[PDB]
């Protein structure tokens, strides 16, 4: 992918998450579990829906071929009609195939951006309160319960609340 | 103690202009630029100082053949373009046909 | 001690539908959608209930 | 049927068809393509 999230630093997808395109997997003292994110999912579904409605609706003016008949002494116009009809069909076939090929590339990269943006959204929230594992996971330098996990998912994580607890853990690890 | 700060931001004007994208519609942007004209004055005007030949109720055939109802166009000046009604009332006062009439009108587009 | 973790990931399933891009061919995606029709019944039916004139 | 072609009718449920250019009725737009698939999900992990 262009943004390096899908099949990138997140090596594989999650078969366990079936209710959303993007989401989180947490692991704390109270257990683990998959959970989908609402913000990226809502934006993506509407974004992809609008892309489909743009490719599929901006073709109502496509060339509709009309059957015309010519006699044996009108071969020039009949050949003119044949080449005129084939040309328009070729133009729209090229237009249809190329639009799909390009928008397919953009759609895959659009999903790649959403994953990377969601990861950076979590990253800039925790800051140095957790450790960047480099595999798509953040290892908290403090206890993070189920309420703490959900606060990260909806852009409300309070950095100063756990900053002092994380500072003690960081100094313990650095000292050896 | 809270130290010095620097921030990165972007422009935010007071324009209600909107555009469209593939994945999103009606997106308000700081600067846009229309490239489509949608207004006309509803008149027929001279083409760079040259008055058009407006046939009014007469047709091209009646003008050329000299229909007595077309005395306005006995000696027309130089024109830029010809304006003809879809079905002028004064076309052939005596009924008949004008042979290769469409071919003559094609030639008249270059005169 | 291994601390608590939160991970960011994307959907995956058992779909076999494939798409093509400009730079890459035969890419498997979770969700795809055909937009082309390739079947016909081989008959000459009525057009919206009106029977055609078959000479 | 709602769309008829010289080779047969088509269920007019998709934007495009590749059966025959000469169509009458509520017909999809004709293309010479053999396949037209829009990716809507993300890159599936094997």
């Amino acid at each position: 992918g262009l943004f390096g999230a899908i099949a990138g630093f997140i090596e594989g997808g999650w078969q366990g998450m079936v209710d959303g395109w993007y989401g989180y997997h947490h692991s704390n003292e109270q257990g683990s579990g998959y959970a989908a994110d609402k913000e990226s999912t809502q934006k993506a579904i509407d974004g992809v829906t609008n892309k489909v409605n743009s490719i599929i609706d901006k073709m109502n003016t496509q060339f509709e071929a009309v059957g015309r008949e010519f006699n044996n002494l009108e071969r020039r116009i009949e050949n003119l009609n044949k080449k005129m009809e084939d040309g328009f069909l070729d133009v729209w076939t090229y237009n249809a195939e190329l639009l799909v090929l390009m928008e397919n590339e953009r759609t895959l990269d659009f999903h790649d951006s959403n994953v990377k943006n969601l990861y950076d959204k979590v990253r800039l929230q925790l800051r140095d309160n957790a450790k960047e594992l480099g595999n798509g996971c953040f290892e908290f330098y403090h206890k993070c319960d189920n309420e703490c996990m959900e606060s990260v998912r909806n852009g409300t994580y309070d950095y100063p609340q756990y900053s002092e607890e994380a500072r003690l853990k960081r100094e313990e690890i650095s000292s050896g | 103690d809270p130290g010095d700060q620097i921030c990165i931001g972007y422009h935010a004007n007071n324009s209600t202009e909107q555009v469209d994208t593939i994945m999103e519609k009606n997106v308000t942007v700081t600067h846009a630029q229309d490239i489509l004209e949608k207004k006309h004055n509803g008149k027929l005007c001279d083409l760079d100082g040259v008055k058009p030949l407006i046939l009014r109720d007469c047709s091209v055939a009646g003008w050329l053949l000299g229909n007595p109802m077309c005395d306005e166009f006995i000696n027309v000046p130089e024109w830029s373009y010809i304006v003809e009604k879809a079905n002028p009332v004064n076309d052939l006062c005596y009924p008949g046909d004008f042979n290769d009439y469409e071919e003559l009108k094609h030639l008249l587009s270059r005169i | 001690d291994p601390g608590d973790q939160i991970c960011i990931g994307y959907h995956a399933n058992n779909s076999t539908e494939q798409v093509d891009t400009i730079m890459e061919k035969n890419v498997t995606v979770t969700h795809a959608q055909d937009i082309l029709e390739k079947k016909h019944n081989g008959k000459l039916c009525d057009l919206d209930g009106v029977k055609p004139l078959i000479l | 049927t709602k769309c008829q072609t010289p080779m047969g009718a088509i269920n007019s449920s998709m934007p495009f068809h590749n059966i025959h250019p000469l169509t009458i009725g509520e017909c999809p737009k004709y293309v010479k393509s053999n396949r037209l698939v829009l990716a809507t999900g993300l890159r599936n992990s094997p």
């Epitope: 579904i45 829906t49 489909v52 409605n53 | 519609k25 | 959608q33 | 809507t40």
Partner: antibody
Framework: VQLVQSGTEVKKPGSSVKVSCKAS????????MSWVRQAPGQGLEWMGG????????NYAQKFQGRLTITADGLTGTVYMELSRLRSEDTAVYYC????????????????WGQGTMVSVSA | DIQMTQSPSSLSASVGDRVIITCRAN??????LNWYQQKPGKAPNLLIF???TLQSGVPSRFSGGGSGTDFTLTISSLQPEDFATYYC?????????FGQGTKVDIKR
Amino acid sequence: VQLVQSGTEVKKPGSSVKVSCKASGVTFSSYAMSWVRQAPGQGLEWMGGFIPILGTANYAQKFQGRLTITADGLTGTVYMELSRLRSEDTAVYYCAREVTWKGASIGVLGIWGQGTMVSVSA
Amino acid sequence: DIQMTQSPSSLSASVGDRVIITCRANQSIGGYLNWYQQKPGKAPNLLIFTASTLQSGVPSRFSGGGSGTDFTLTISSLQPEDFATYYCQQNYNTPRTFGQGTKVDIKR
């Protein structure tokens, strides 16, 4: 665009009702639809939805197993099928397009139909 | 599920008054709320989506705001066209939930 539904149905108990939701014009659309019922003089009730780009239909708990929301491909037409009808199913059934002036909007019902009234008695 | 409760259930006002309708929830829905207006014998018409943004054609007198669990729909100058039932709908959870319904009534 406008959304048009079927006519008023007078069904017998235990039968099935299929209500269509077509759009006006030959245009093809992949907008997500939603079916909402409203009992006579009561409030609105979400029955289910259908997201064409996902190919899935979402249903409600009180309708699961009795409701079938399908679509005629990409023609902008969606269908609902309520089975095992009872007198308590008597209501006005609406179909709404999930769209705003911003384009597709998966949650908000911008364009509505006219409603199809369903009556159930022996 | 996410139960949505409206307050008040049926208010009374006259032309020119400021009408405030509050819609609650039993779970935080993060700004994913919509407002609808139903006139007698007519399909519901959308007024506000995403709890703040007005749908096209809605007069500026209609206003909305809120975040989390408490929401508000406000009509600055009530005109003899806003007398109807108002519903609040969530677009956060898959089992979509509607409000009970608040009916603004003519005062006399």
